[PDB]
Homo-oligomer: A and B are copies of this chain.
Amino acid sequence: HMADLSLEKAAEVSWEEEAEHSGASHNILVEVQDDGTMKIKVLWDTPSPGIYRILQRGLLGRSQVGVGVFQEGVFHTMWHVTRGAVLMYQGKRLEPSWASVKKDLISYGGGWRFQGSWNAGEEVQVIAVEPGKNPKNVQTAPGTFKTGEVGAIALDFKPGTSGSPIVNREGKIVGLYGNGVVTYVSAIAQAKASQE
């Protein structure tokens, strides 16, 4: 006590063409033409951008309590994973900068950096970083639910995977794979990016 959490890199962010699809249904955008054709449409001194495991030292070894993403020197994860705890990376203490309990989000080292917005009917990929597994891209079709109207995803991952990022076809992050309500769906948890 304290400084019980530390980070370890696990992957880079990208959309994988030909990633595995999972889910009840697919959303497929079709282009129809009048001619009868139908078509299915320097080293920086900053933490290296990527996906990282958030790890807590336990009795059987370090267990993964969640995942997050460094982008532009800012670490983004879920509020329930750390609750504002300092994070150790390379001997350095990372202090929290911004949080939204309501969206279940938090950033360390600056304000929310993600710019992606998800659009109803598009499919996304979750870059699931499950405890003891290699990162895996899972293509899925979110539904929407009303309140902001929110994307929600019906996929089931191991405990500790929350904070894995959800990317669109451009490879931009549209949110983080959240905790769910239950018919287990997780919100696409996103905030607006920050400014001076």
Chain A interface (Cβ < 8 Å from any Cβ of B): 1, 4, 56-65, 80, 82-83, 85, 101-104, 131-133, 145, 147-148, 150, 152, 156-162, 178-185, 187, 189
Contact = CB atoms under 8 A, between A and B. Distances in A.
Contacts of A178: 58, 63
A14 to B, nearest CB: 24
- How many copies, total? 2
A152 B63 CA distance: 14
Which of A4, A83, A101, A147 has the most CB atoms of chain B within a 10 A radius of its CB? A83
Contacts of A59: 102-104, 147-148, 150, 187, 189
A63 B179 contact: yes
A63 B161 CA distance: 15
Given A83-B85, A159-B159, A159-B161, A56 B179 contact: yes
The A interface is mostly helix, strand or loop, or mixed, namely loop
Contacts of A131: 180-182, 184
Given A104-B56, A159-B162, A181 B62 contact: yes
A169 to B, nearest CB: 24
Contacts of A64: 179
